A paper describes a structure:
[name] ([name]) is an anion exchanger expressed in the apical membranes of selected epithelia. Encoded by the gene [name], [name] belongs to the solute carrier 26 (SLC26) family. [name] ablation causes Pendred syndrome, a genetic disorder associated with sensorineural hearing loss, hypothyroid goiter, and reduced blood pressure.
Similarly, the [name] sample in the anion pair of Cl−/I− (1:3) ([name]-Cl/I) was prepared and used for structure determination. Symmetric inward-open and asymmetric homodimers were observed with approximate percentage of 75 and 25%, respectively. After superimposing all structures we resolved, we found very little difference among inward-open structures or among outward-open structures, respectively, with root mean squared deviation (RMSD) no more than 0.5 Å. The asymmetric homodimer consists of one inward-facing protomer and the other outward-facing protomer, representing coincident uptake and secretion- a unique state of [name] as an electroneutral exchanger. Considering the significant cross-section area increase from inward-open state to outward-open state, we hypothesize that when one protomer is outward-open, the other one would be inward-open to minimize their effects on the outer leaflet. Therefore, the coincidence of secretion and uptake in this asymmetric homodimer shapes the molecular basis of the electroneutral exchange of [name] with an inverted alternate-access mechanism.
Author numbering:
A (entry chain A): 18 to 595, 651 to 737
B (entry chain B): 18 to 596, 651 to 733
Write the structure that this text describes.
């Protein structure tokens, strides 16, 4: 239809006179905290069901086919998880048994406190890399070597194989306990807005840099070289240079086997991902490649005849729980916070993906509490921080998963592979386990293809991705996240400090105002210059507003007044002996403002007063109600600056100006 | 007065089909790189005029209240400048001989280059310890340590003199020159937007603990409490408790001397403010309490008969310029960057605290090159850094003062005090001049009265003011402004992340849409609701924008879809076996106050439209003027079905569209 209205010009005061405002509710802090404290059984049952979601999906089971679905998904997920754990155990500088330990206890702890259905809690390459890095920084290799072995010239300060692994495991357990404590603190205090700052490009660049560092570390492990655990600034570049300079001390057989298994696994994964319509169940290439590697490595003495690198350090048993060594929290609090926040970000991402894929809800604070409790329980049993891997979660989702019971069954596989099974994997080469990690890096390596897409989009979003990826390589990986979040906040501040001001004008015989820099056939009021200023004025962008006003009016309220004062004294001396031509009004269309930052309202009142001396009226067009209520308390409506200066709509100001010009020449 | 705005409802595609756009100018730098100043002499004369801020106020001052006012004010800050030069020089582990030069030469080059009044360039308390820190690190205390002097048992390892202090001044001279050239090279690329981040409560909360820092630094000299040097964290607390712990060895004669002078100097100060209409010219009590103190000290010998503490070490005569060591600039370069940044912060912070009481707003780019060449001019003469003390700028502004010429005449007082008035201020008790800074310090101590004022105006800046005040006490003045600057920017990103979202509603028989939580007797369209976020949808408020919708519509778009298919699968199996939705039709997001969008926002906003589309509830939008509209279509917001027809120019056009549709 059509749009036509008829109403008087209610600028600021003609609207608030016949409009009874809504009185705010009484605070009553005592009764507020008293009423908020729930005591009925309904709220108690609700918070119990929320805190322990296990009692929710259990009574409504569909055992009939869910039993078989969960048992097959559980055996598949258990195989995949024990393989990923025995692969990532090298990234934590701990023996291979602790990876399987951390692949068993966190699942049992999440089964009774989790709220998702497809999230496979377990090891993660990025988290394991960060744990290994902080362990090497806190416990280097050259800090445990013992002189023994009757050396030739000096004391035989060989490796400390033995008690060194116990110290590393205790350090990892303390780190996991601190991470769990930090996560529980973030969850219980309802502080969950801190993880909102991890933007999608930021986390993408961080995952890309972490995958690059994981590739570097796995190539170091495959080549079987001896580095000096370079950590700190340019650690990845320095260790890559050291690898390139230490090529001579490699293993040709291990390198050939690693390249072969890498090619095979990549080809099989690509074939399964591309031709999915012909094979419904993904072929567990990891399982078969591990089986064939253990079979080939057992036939011949690859440890003696080829000098390969195997584990051969599997005790095949459990251990009583050990209390963590408290006292190292002050020097690892930042690392624990970084690990916790990156793990929570990755977990929330995976959960949202697999939830919008299956159309169910996942709570954030509940997942935070669940991961915190899981890490706390793992810290008491010599385990590292657990997360959800994209590759491990994809297998459980492809095999068919409904509830966390498949995860409970997934622990049974690791369970039987810890107590009795496991010693058969003795001659397995470490390069084989170090290869599947590289093969799983294809997902995060293809994330670089977004920069050509993001560059065509908003350019500031692409700068954050490149900055996060590059900075997380120079000053390590842990400090790179802190340098990325601050950079993202600074980029946000830059977008609100430099707004997009225009020359808003009116279309002929209309009421809507559009910009003049993007249109040609627009009419402007005679003398009146309209200006719109988004990105509300604060202490940092007030000079920007001054410059924008000076540019849109053509002159300066200071220089014109100084010239007027200089010409005024010339008149008083001549009688004793014997610029602002086109500008008529200035309508500020501050309709996109949210806050005011009274430090800036001072300069706004200063501008209004300065333009009054040069007889140039400066009005307002579309100020919000809350903004005006805030400016009223900030001391802006004095005896001269009344409410008639403000307006409700942009057209009302122009209409009032036209009426005043017609009625007063 | 009524007005006829009869016009059919216009959407985006219905408004761009009859109008025309404008070709945006790319403005490539391959041919437009010489458009700033090629041959026009007007632009050349402009940059020279701004480069020399001497042709602006000097040919413009009025001599009515200029001659007598600035002279009596110059000697006031000139006397204080002499004490700071004689005090801060000892703390820098260098001989106390060049303190007077740092207040004479840098003022001359700043008198012509630099437009910032009420500032006395010279040494600063917290910057003198930083110089003494880097000197003792890269230079041992004993250079040669000649073991001679026929000691008790072994050779008397006497500390070498003459050559030791000469190298210390040479090292300090190279440091000031290295900071100067670094201070000047920053002005090349014109980084002057950093001063815009220093808010009035930021500099107000900063120049209130520094007034407390300069209070405790002047309290240990007025009480003669030998305390150790402390810097970094808890510097003010450790020095405060040391005075109270070492209060025993306090000069009783010097205590009653300073206590009697601090009262009489502040009493006459407020008396001049009360009788300012009677006596036109303010009485310079600073020069009065100075000459009477030398009389009671020289006529009674307060040093050798009362042990009160005097200067008694005033040098005489200038020194020729000495060339620095270029081969040592590489070592000080790693440490001068930290000192150069904190110097410029304190230098401009004392200019903004006085910019609120007088309309003298300055620019950071001009002050960066002004103080830059001043420290360069400070070089080659073995001077100190060209900072500005907080005590000298207070005694000049509170006790009169019109322009920067008060610093020029102050150097003249220092000029005659070194060549002809050296023996004059010899018995100065170092108390009447170390406590006179406390009298003029009330101008900054009374600045804490804005806490109840700012709290009633806006809660955010009130927290910023008290935060920077308490943080500068613990983390010191060095990291205090740095931590407060990040906290000030944090309040900007928080206010833009959690806006004041409210549901809007029209007024009867009109098209004005205002908030319903602040007004009454409003009405809402049956089945159509209005939501105004009034904030940009960036990566931080992505879920906050979702929580704003589900809390306003009553339901949650996520839980109504899974329960819909749950009931759908429930009734489906019953057919083979045998047999809370709000009536709101659509919602119009009044997201007109958005200023920018990101890739996370355009993706999340697309998911919201697709989410409500599956629930048979449409979602419409509001005015996206120039940027937030073109950015969405560039990020791939319209793929197959979502079109620009769902948008609207005005909020009322959205209501009229849903009205005639049903």
């Amino acid at each position: 239809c059509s749009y036509t209205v008829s109403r008087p010009v209610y600028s600021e005061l003609a609207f608030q006179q016949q409009r009874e405002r809504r009185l705010p509710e009484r605070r009553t802090l005592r009764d507020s905290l008293a009423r908020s404290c729930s005591c009925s059984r309904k709220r108690a049952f609700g918070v119990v069901k929320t805190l322990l979601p296990i009692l929710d999906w259990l009574p409504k089971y569909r055992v009939k086919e869910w039993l078989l679905s969960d048992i097959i998904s559980g055996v598949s997920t258990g195989l995949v998880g024990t393989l990923q754990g025995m692969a990532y155990a090298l990234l934590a500088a701990v023996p291979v048994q602790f990876g399987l330990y951390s692949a068993f206890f966190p699942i049992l702890t999440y089964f009774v406190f989790g709220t998702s259905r497809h999230i496979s809690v377990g090891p993660f390459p990025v988290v394991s890399l960060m744990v290994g890095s902080v362990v090497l920084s806190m416990a280097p290799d050259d800090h445990f070597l013992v002189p023994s072995g009757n050396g030739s010239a000096l004391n035989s300060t060989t490796l400390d194989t033995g008690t060194r692994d116990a110290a590393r495991v205790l350090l990892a357990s303390t780190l996991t306990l601190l991470v769990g404590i930090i996560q529980l603190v973030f969850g219980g205090l309802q502080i969950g807005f801190i993880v909102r700052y991890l933007a999608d490009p930021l986390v993408g660049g961080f995952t890309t840099a972490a995958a690059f560092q994981v590739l570097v570390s796995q190539l170091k492990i495959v080549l079987n070289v001896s580095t000096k655990n370079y950590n700190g600034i340019l650690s990845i570049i320095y260790t890559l240079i050291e690898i390139f300079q230490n090529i001579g001390d490699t293993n040709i057989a291990d390198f050939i086997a690693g390249l072969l298994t890498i090619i095979v696994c990549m080809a099989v994964k690509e074939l399964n991902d591309r031709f999915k319509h012909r094979i419904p169940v993904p072929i567990p290439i990891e399982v078969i490649v591990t089986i064939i590697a253990t079979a080939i490595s057992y036939g011949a003495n690859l440890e003696k005849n080829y000098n390969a690198g195997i584990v051969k350090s599997i005790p095949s048993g459990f251990l009583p729980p050990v209390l963590p060594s408290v006292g190292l929290f002050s020097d690892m609090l930042a690392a624990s916070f970084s690990i916790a926040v990156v793990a929570y970000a990755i977990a929330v991402s995976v959960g949202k993906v697999y939830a919008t894929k299956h159309d169910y809800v996942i709570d954030g604070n509940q997942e935070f509490i669940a991961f915190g409790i899981s890490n706390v329980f793992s810290g008491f049993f010599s385990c590292f921080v657990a997360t959800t891997a994209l590759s491990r979660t994809a297998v459980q989702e492809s095999t068919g998963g409904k509830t966390q019971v498949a995860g409970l069954i997934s622990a049974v596989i690791v369970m039987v592979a810890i107590v009795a099974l496991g010693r058969l994997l003795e001659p397995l080469q470490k390069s084989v386990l170090a290869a599947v990690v590289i093969a799983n890096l294809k997902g995060m390596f293809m994330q670089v293809c977004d920069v050509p897409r993001l560059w065509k989009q908003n350019k500031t979003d692409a700068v954050i991705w490149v900055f996060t990826c590059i900075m997380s390589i120079i000053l390590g990986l842990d400090l790179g996240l802190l340098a990325g979040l601050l950079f993202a906040l600074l980029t946000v501040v830059l977008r609100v400090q430099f707004p997009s001001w225009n020359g808003l004008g009116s279309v002929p015989s209309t009421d809507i105002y559009k910009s003049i820099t993007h249109y040609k056939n627009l009419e402007e009021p005679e003398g009146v210059k309209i200006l719109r200023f988004s990105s509300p004025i604060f202490y940092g962008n007030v000079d920007g507003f001054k410059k924008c006003i000076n540019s849109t009016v053509g002159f300066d309220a200071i220089r014109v007044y100084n010239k007027r004062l200089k010409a005024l004294r010339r008149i008083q001396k001549l009688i004793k002996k014997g610029p602002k031509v086109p500008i008529h009004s200035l309508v500020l269309d501050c309709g996109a403002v949210s806050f005011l930052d009274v430090v800036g309202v001072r300069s706004l009142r200063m501008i209004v007063k300065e333009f009054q001396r040069i007889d140039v009226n400066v009005y307002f067009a579309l100020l919000q109600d809350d903004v005006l209520e805030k400016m009223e308390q900030c001391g802006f409506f004095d005896d001269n600056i009344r409410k008639d200066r403000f307006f409700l709509t942009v057209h009302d100001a122009i209409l009032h100006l036209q009426n005043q010009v017609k009625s007063r020449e």
